[PDB]
């Protein structure tokens, strides 16, 4: 599983940070301290952490991931990481 997508809403200084979908690696989610939930209004499960994205990026780097790209879409900041 080389690619990873993480995100946060505007105010990058604060969480939550979305770190996965239903088919995400459960061990990686457990390592990040992520919890699984289906938020009201969504028809899908997600993994999230209370940490701001900077903490998550440092945690993932210690797991071989590297930020390939970062973008804004609406009020969301998204990071695309690749295991390398």
């Amino acid at each position: 599983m080389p690619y990873l997508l993480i995100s946060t809403q505007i105010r990058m200084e604060v969480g939550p940070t979305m770190v996965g979908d239903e088919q995400s690696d459960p061990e990686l989610m457990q390592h990040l301290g992520a919890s699984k939930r289906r938020a009201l209004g969504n028809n899908f499960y997600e993994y999230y952490v209370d940490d701001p994205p900077r903490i998550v990026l440092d945690k993932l780097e210690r797991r071989g991931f590297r930020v390939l790209s970062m973008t804004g879409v609406g009020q969301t900041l998204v990071w695309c990481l690749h295991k390398e």
């Binding site: 009201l40 209004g41 969504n42 028809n43 609406g74």
Partner: protein
Amino acid sequence: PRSEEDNELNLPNLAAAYSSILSSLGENPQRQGLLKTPWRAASAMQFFTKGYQETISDVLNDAIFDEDHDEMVIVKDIDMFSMCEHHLVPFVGKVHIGYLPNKQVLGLSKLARIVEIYSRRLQVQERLTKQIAVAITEALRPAGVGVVVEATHMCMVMRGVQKMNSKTVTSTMLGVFREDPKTREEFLTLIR
């Protein structure tokens, strides 16, 4: 849920309590105009709280039609009458409901009936708003939901702060109604 047997059993207790209120306020419950008031005030409070007798699936009456309609559905200006749980005085207004179906479509009147299950109870506007939104969300599992409730609270107009022109507006935006700026501006435009 509250039953018709419960209603027959508790009606005399409600009437007796209203008769006691008339006496405690200094009034004569025996004067022409007050004689049937214990029974009338009692029946009114039962009707005002008739939502406790209802279930979301009974109300729906299997009116969920599996139709593929990729369009916004709004039922607006639904008259909403409710009871403030803090002072027991009415809060009255309108509810505007919008949704974007996924696979199932609800019968138009069932949206007004979902308003009635929760409004006909002792409430707070924010709870009422959330309950309407969650009922639609769990019944249809749509792409998004929007629920706006505007109401005049008698306890804010007839007493207390006595700000006679004020109104309370509550707004729940779920799924694509929260995420998409286009979807939200559209729902908010089409309800006015």
